[PDB]
Amino acid sequence: GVPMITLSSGIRMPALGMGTAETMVKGTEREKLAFLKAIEVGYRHFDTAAAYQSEECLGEAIAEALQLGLIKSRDELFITSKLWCADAHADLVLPALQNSLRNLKLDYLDLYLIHHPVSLKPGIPKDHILPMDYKSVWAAMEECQTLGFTRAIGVCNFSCKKLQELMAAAKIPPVVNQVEMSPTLHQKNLREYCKANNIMITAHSVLGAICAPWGSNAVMDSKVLHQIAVARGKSVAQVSMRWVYQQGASLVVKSFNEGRMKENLKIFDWELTAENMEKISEIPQSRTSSADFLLSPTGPFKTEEEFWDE
């Protein structure tokens, strides 16, 4: 099945997880049925965020998955949620996590991440984007683990530069850095630093977010990946996701239909040859998921090069 990844703290992590559609609107009951279907197919790692108001759909799906005997216990699952920038302030982190736990109908999370390396004024508007205090927020994240409300803590979309900034006063180092990674964004430099510090790389937007406004077609319409997919008898989607795992990375994928989420679990039964990786290593680079919704002429980051340090 899905291999387990041993994180730096000893916590086991299912290498392949399923995320939630990045819609900052309410949750549909078709989302809940998709989560329940993933559990029935064989997914145990699920990745949500408080910014998408879809946690209650995952909480309902977990509850019904236990009712239907699909899983026998909650400790069979690896639930992850993220801290929204509006609550990315010291005294506001623990109320934020306890709210996500009440929405999820859970008592603890398996992993708690910081969504973006920025803060927001508690109330996209560009006047509200505020520079993050990495030391005080991470200390609150560190307390969230000590009190038992989460088993591990991490970060999302953190550059190698900003990681060292958070690693300075860190008592509990980040276990996971969830960043964009695909055959069009190799992240060699970031994966080089995280490997030497035992930070796990979890890849989002493995397919370039073809369905989102901030996405592109650089992965799904790649004629390089098409050629490999036919040689190996796979789809373009499985070639990209196999590449991420074969680089020693975790990955969260968004599955809107039972056809794809059944095929996604088959990336662990085959292997890309040595050339296949060399032909992919020379693919031109293009970052899809842009933080231009977080770029403010008044805030900490005003260009794409400052947010990503590239």
Author numbering: 5 to 127, 133 to 319
Copied sentences from the primary study:
The aldo-keto reductase (AKR) codeinone reductase (COR) catalyzes the final and penultimate steps in the biosynthesis of codeine and morphine, respectively, in opium poppy (Papaver somniferum). COR belongs to the large and well-studied AKR superfamily, which is characterized by the TIM-barrel fold and mechanistically flexible NAD(P)H dependant oxidoreductase activity. The overall three-dimensional structure of COR reveals a TIM-barrel fold common to the AKR superfamily, in which eight parallel β-strands form a central barrel surrounded by eight α-helices to form the (α/β)8 barrel. The residues that form the canonical catalytic tetrad are contributed by the β2α2 loop (Asp-51 and Tyr-56), β3 (Lys-86) and loop A (His-119).
The crystal structure of the COR1.3 isoform (hereafter referred to as COR) was solved using molecular replacement and refined to a resolution of 2.4 Å. The crystal structure described in this paper thus represents an apoenzyme state with a well-defined binding pocket for the NADPH cofactor similar to that seen for other AKRs binding to either NADPH or NADH. The most notable structural feature of COR is the shifting of the β1α1 loop away from the cofactor binding tunnel, which is made particularly evident when compared with structures of CHR and 3α-HSD. The distinctive conformation adopted by the β1α1 loop widens the cofactor binding tunnel and helps to define the putative binding site for the alkaloid substrate, primarily through the side chain and carbonyl group of Glu-26 and the side chain of Met-28. The asymmetric unit of this crystal structure of apo-COR reveals three homodimers with C2 rotational symmetry. A single disulfide bond is formed between Cys-220 of each protomer near the bottom of the V-shaped cleft. The lack of conservation of the Cys-220 residue and the reported localization of COR in a reducing environment in the plant suggest that the intermolecular disulfide bond may be the result of purifying and crystallizing COR in an aerobic environment, even though reducing agent was present during purification, and protein samples were stored at –80 °C prior to crystallization.
